[PDB]
Symmetry: D2
Subunit: 498 residues, 4 copies
Amino acid sequence: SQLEHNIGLSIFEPVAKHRANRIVCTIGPSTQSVEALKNLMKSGMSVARMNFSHGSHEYHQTTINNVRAAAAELGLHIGIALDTKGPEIRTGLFKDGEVSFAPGDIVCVTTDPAYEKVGTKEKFYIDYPQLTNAVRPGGSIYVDDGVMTLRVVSKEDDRTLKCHVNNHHRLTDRRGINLPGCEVDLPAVSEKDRKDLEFGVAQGVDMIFASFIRTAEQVREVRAALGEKGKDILIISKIENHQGVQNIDSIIEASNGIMVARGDLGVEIPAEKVCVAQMCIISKCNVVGKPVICATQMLESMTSNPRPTRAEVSDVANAVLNGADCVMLSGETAKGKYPNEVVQYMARICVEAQSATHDTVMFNSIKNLQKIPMCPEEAVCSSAVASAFEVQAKAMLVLSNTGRSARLISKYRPNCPIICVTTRLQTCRQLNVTRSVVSVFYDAAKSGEDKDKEKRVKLGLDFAKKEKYASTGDVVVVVHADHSVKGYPNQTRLIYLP
Amino acid sequence: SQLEHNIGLSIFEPVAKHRANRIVCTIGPSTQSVEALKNLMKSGMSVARMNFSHGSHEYHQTTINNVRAAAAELGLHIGIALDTKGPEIRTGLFKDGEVSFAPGDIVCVTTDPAYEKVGTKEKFYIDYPQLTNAVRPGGSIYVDDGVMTLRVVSKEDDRTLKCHVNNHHRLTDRRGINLPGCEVDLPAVSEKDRKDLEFGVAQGVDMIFASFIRTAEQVREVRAALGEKGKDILIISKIENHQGVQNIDSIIEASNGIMVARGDLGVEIPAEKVCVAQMCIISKCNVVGKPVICATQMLESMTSNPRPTRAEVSDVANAVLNGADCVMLSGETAKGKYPNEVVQYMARICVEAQSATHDTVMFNSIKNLQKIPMCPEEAVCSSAVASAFEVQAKAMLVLSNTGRSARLISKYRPNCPIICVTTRLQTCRQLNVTRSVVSVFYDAAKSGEDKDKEKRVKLGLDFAKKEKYASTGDVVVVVHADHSVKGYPNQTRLIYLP
Amino acid sequence: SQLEHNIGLSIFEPVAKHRANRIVCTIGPSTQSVEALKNLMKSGMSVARMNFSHGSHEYHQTTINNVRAAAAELGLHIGIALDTKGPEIRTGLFKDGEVSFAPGDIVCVTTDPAYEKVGTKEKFYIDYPQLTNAVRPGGSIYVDDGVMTLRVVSKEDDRTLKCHVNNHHRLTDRRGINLPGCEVDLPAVSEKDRKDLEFGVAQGVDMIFASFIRTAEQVREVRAALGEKGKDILIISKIENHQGVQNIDSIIEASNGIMVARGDLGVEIPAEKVCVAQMCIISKCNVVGKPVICATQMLESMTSNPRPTRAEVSDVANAVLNGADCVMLSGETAKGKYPNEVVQYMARICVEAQSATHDTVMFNSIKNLQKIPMCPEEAVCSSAVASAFEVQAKAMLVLSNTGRSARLISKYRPNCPIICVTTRLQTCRQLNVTRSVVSVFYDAAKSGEDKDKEKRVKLGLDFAKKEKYASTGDVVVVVHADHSVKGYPNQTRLIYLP
Amino acid sequence: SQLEHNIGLSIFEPVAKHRANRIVCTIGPSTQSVEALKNLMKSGMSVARMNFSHGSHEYHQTTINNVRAAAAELGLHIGIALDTKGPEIRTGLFKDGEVSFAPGDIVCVTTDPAYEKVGTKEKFYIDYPQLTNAVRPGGSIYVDDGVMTLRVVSKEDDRTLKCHVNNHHRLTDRRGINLPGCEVDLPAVSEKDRKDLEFGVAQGVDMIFASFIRTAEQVREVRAALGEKGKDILIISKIENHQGVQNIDSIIEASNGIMVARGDLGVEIPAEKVCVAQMCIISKCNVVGKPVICATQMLESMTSNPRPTRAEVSDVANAVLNGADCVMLSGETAKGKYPNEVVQYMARICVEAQSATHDTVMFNSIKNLQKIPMCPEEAVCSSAVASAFEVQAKAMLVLSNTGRSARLISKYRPNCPIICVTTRLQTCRQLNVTRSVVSVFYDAAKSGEDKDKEKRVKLGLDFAKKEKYASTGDVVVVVHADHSVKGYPNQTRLIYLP
Ligand SMILES: O=P(O)(O)OC[C@H]1O[C@@](CO)(OP(=O)(O)O)[C@@H](O)[C@@H]1O
Ligand SMILES: O=P(O)(O)OC[C@H]1O[C@@](CO)(OP(=O)(O)O)[C@@H](O)[C@@H]1O
Ligand SMILES: [Cl-]
Ligand SMILES: [Cl-]
Ligand SMILES: [K+]
Ligand SMILES: [K+]
Ligand SMILES: [K+]
Ligand SMILES: [K+]
Ligand SMILES: [Mg+2]
Ligand SMILES: [Mg+2]
Ligand SMILES: [Mg+2]
Ligand SMILES: [Mg+2]
């Protein structure tokens, strides 16, 4: 039981040497320089996130170039993720550029674009034409990240709602609007997003973090916009509202990965419900073997302070115990004073959580929910992980060109590193969002085609020795195809390191 | 499995109607008035904590009096906890009330009280007279929640250490000092602690939160300071150093319960190890059926903001999922701007985590670890909980005078309230630290002996109806003695509400 | 696991002192005398079975009278069971009163009653009018307990089947016919059976063993034939063919109990399938908490030999491990040379099987398959058994007038005796088919009405002491109602024996 | 649970197509001809047992020769077992070839061979010269499968005991004698056993069934009598006395497998304890992955009847459900009237029990008991079985030369056949005692070395197709070494049949 496992935990024992979980860092003025990014990489960053909510293509090109240069210098493969602005609802403008409200204030809100630029205390504009179908009397409209909240008293005409102001607040021009619990019908890709996706495709980003995904259809529109040239870029869907949570099964099916985007989510749904969504969404991703990222305010106070609060430490540990492949930093690295320290703390917390995890509980739980019969590559990957537990293997080694087989092994949550020998550099970069995996690049143009695997296996076992995962005489579990089967791995071997 | 349970969670189901977990609030200037206490109680405070780190006896006397008046107005039993100063260490005062340090600012710290008032960038006072024994050259001194550290360059003399300041910090007055891994030989009951405890006994406090407990022996010292008249006051040992964690088993055996005192703990040991300690301590308490409180920085940001962070909500939810009876607030209610709201958030988060909990996993895990044969009262209480599950009982009802039988039922973690009819007001107040329990007072002096239990049972069934736990036709599981047995409950009944 | 439980078994340890399973013995010329029946009772017989396939009402009246006299002499309550002849299909007669067949012989079989008395090698009569709808070409007809088998080659007209003889055999007049795998539409109660049921009702038999039950409807016709005066007599349905197995759920629902009548069953279905039916039927009875008897050839060789074969010993042990309340002797006691010895061996084998049973596996398995919410009496009975395991109770004690609550406790398979204090002597007799139960009679006419239970509880605890189930200072789990609830037990107590 | 599995069983589903369990038949006059052996083999005999209790070397030489000729005609590998006489004890001969005893017939038994031929109601011979040491006055002497017992009234002299006959028995010639609980110091290898074993080695028998093994030391004695040329012959230790059961752990560790020799066992210990011993011994063998045979009186009545009893069918089914690799026939085939039919019933019953077995309960129970870390070959074999389950493989295929790897796969109890391609004919024959395994011989001298395994794998895949285990498109789980590793299998592949 979990309870029995807890009572036997020790704070004194040595922790795991090899960190399994992965860290996504948002780049900003604290961290954009090549030097700063090197240090972020040494501290534990695996994926650099560009938040296209702010900043021009020029700003972000600089992030791209610097990330590549810092990674080249250190000889790391660092993923690059483009996180979209996404669609939004916002208010219009206000007379004099601001207005203040008091509890009890009655205010009309209108979708009549006549009122767009002349917002007053009496009446102002929201740029969502379907507003009066989307929220009904007694429902709420949140303004400005949920900070001001309105209750809908009545619908006055097909374009106007009379509302009750719930708290003191001062609005300025074009604040954000949330319609918590309401279906919101907006394109998956704005016109800005297209330009932003086109840039990403041209600069060779490894993955998109797609904002405000509500339906599987929207995932497909994002994939369509990426086009032929972007067909290999991961789409990681951001679950940010009740629709995303409701539709999660088909959203997972259509995505490469999920981000539990807790910031907007905890505005769209009651904040205390974010823990339920988080647990559910992470476990649902674990079950199908797709990467999941937990995001937003994990180590927030380290934006200004050199150590984290007690709540923050438990937050990161618990994301890891819930099952998340990745955890994410936003403000903490984009603009905070302690970018390296916050990454270093995150890394250490991940390692403690990992070391406190019961080896085999995840493996068994995940395996017990798979449909039988499995595909043969999945039988091979799950049983390779089992056989790793049986021999206390110190590493596993898999050949994967697309990354598929690596993610399939990570799905079964071994307790050791998964060394992936790949022939694609973008695969190295993309596997950064997958728990346990460490990539080595095999250059087939330079070394030859390796139909019999032996060079790639050699390279992987050499890597394992070099990086101190295992040494001579240790068993390594090795997964690839035999000499004739193409397209997936049908073979597992236990090999002693020479 | 946990995983299978997780994937079934919904954010759209109704939540539990009756909150099982319990909230401890620290009283300060925000919260000491009768009016403010009433509102804390309305918001969900079950125990008021007085922090004897600060304030005179007169100040706390006002807290005691105000809590009793508030509670009597609302008709509630609110526990009162005296939290000791203990072996605390602090700076003196400073020139102007703050000094500012830069990394490498060589600084003299002195045990000599002549510098108490008059601290400066180059010399200040610390109130631990054996300082220059406890920490030698090369050692480190942690200042104000470990935010600033000083490496000891050298011993100037028996009263004075020359220190290297290691990082940027602006220092306020009387800040806390930790010396992790140092030989600190201070009493668990100082002279000042002894007077505090005697004050507590005189004023009839329900429980002690005993700071810095390191050994079972120290628990017994606190018990001896409480003396003959203090013998029924609970001793909740606060685990907040390395030794406390080492000695947790015997500390638990000696105490009536435990606090995971994460604030000091996360300076005394590395912060990232706190999550492991927490998990281990909470589960060890659950296994023996003793109350356990998770403390410190749970909703920290709500000291100044109207909403908590995503990490803070998670922290509360997970302490509950960990198995904690109680969660605690410190500065959030003592001195924050939103004391009522922070308690209300905590309550909502508790109920959410409670509703996300698998019914029977705790019951089974805890039961599977108990020595067979059990004592009859434990066989009775655990099988009463099992029957509650089998019939989907909406409440249980137990007669308990000491509180033992209520705590024995709560040990098996039913999913419904436990209505406890008790003959002692102090039992009502002390059972505030026990998950699920709701107390009703039966005045045996005023109402008679009740040998056949019928008066107390009726009082309990009527309470169940009034507080809307159950209605006519609902089955209730009722635990007390038959007509002969004295000293424990030997009987369970299922009873339809009349 | 079962496997782990096995590897820790010891042949050397002491076996259980109190035999839980029960033995049904068929009475015949070896065993009909009062003396013989006394010895059968001392050897371990709980239920005397009268096989109304043979013998007149006069013969059976003698069994009834002698059973009662022997039981009175010993002060035991012995159940009396009337086992019906039941409906049958048989051949007609043969010329010269016999005929011999050889493999390959072609024979017409007809339902034309013209041919009833003139059976030849060429053609003979079977008295089942629906024969040519019931078996199709390629199907089989078994004659004479399956000893000769015919293959149906073709249907010649609506009353005649041309058949192929499969083995050497000699038929005499009116042999038994089985149509294996065929639905057989015959009344549940023949005209003989009515007379036999009327006798049983008038002589006060405790239970019917109803032969050849195929459908729930037939159970109801047997209950109808027993009438008002027989409404309290148990109906134990004999599963003897494929329909019975197919319809087992609704047959269990309609019966009081089941007998796995393996003799006819292993004729009607392939003999190797009888083990599958047995396991299934027993487990299905365990799950609903109704008594099940395993019957036929269990110790067959002891009909002539003074000790059993190795197969026979495993047969009885395995019936007990499968979950059967009772095991049965037929020829072994009706006409065998070693009636006492065979009962004594059976008893010893039951005790070994019982002692090798994992205490709590059954309890948990059975409980995990009950629908929630349970009725309250069932919650009380299952949790009483749980609490017996928790305290290693040496006995339980239940007040039951109809036997219902006793059977409800036995359903959860405690490892100790269940002492039932009843107010009905027929309940004492009927509880003989229920595992673990030992009855004591409370004479309410003679001792008074005992609304507060205390006399019946006294009598039960005295009994427990007398019969050496427990002694002073041992815990006994005691189940009945509280002082107001009528019609079922809503209360459990743990009581120390004074 | 077992219970839940049971209630789901159906008698109407198709049964398994490939019988996993194995049948050992004893050869005698019924079965010694080439023709009769062919038919036994066709009926499902996998191992022929020669019982060296009886017959000369010439007689058994005929058995050996006839088995090889039968097997070669049918193209089968049939194991040949030599079952030793061992420390047997028997009566001499009698006046007329039988005497009859009555309870209380005082009778003299003598070690003096002068009475060997000429035994009578008042004096007869027993062939154990130390009789009057081994059993003293008050002791008991068990005669002919314990059917008759004699209490020793007194020691007449060193050669003679005066006995009280205790029950009715008619005594035939050379009947068996047991002296349970008596000090019997006879060799495990008598002089006569030594010549028998040497004969066996000369004639190339595949295995020894070693009677009356009591200690690991005795196993080592049998091994030493087999000498250098006999070192690869399996030693199956027969457990048939009290000490054998006591010492089962070390006896198992010393042997290649075990027989539960229920005939002698059930006289040496009380008969009802045999079921416990059986369960314990079989499971201990399963846990270490050594072959285990259940023996004696399984289908006893079929010695003279065409159909078995309900107990006998049950006995076979439960030995299989217990976990036994093999079940055995003695008199049933040696000297019975229906040798072919009794083997056919046994086969059908095996397949029925096999089909009633929960797929994966054995796999998990056995795996959960193994020491971690495993050897690589065991991690490979157990995870190969798990992948077979995951893909619903219709066969596995293993290369094994010694048989070790085939037995290691069979230890984890897959539900499909295990096709073993071996380079040793003797391995083919010895793997007949291992559940599931079907052997194909690869002649490396004739066909070449096969370093890359492709010849043997093809031979195995073609066999799978021919024997209808799988067809084109079916996945098969294939276990051998990769191209480098020698001495064990380190590799698993899933392969679609071409
Ligand atoms: O790129 P993914 O989809 O992970 O597939 C990789 C698997 O397919 C194979 C065989 O096709 O690749 P490869 O041809 O490069 O050797 C296996 O060796 C390898 O494990
Ligand atoms: O005869 P059953 O149906 O078992 O019911 C017996 C139960 O009902 C009660 C109460 O009605 O019987 P009783 O009235 O004889 O005392 C319980 O005490 C007793 O356990
Ligand atoms: Cl206007
Ligand atoms: Cl005729
Ligand atoms: K964004
Ligand atoms: K304090
Ligand atoms: K009958
Ligand atoms: K022998
Ligand atoms: Mg967002
Ligand atoms: Mg503290
Ligand atoms: Mg019958
Ligand atoms: Mg023998």
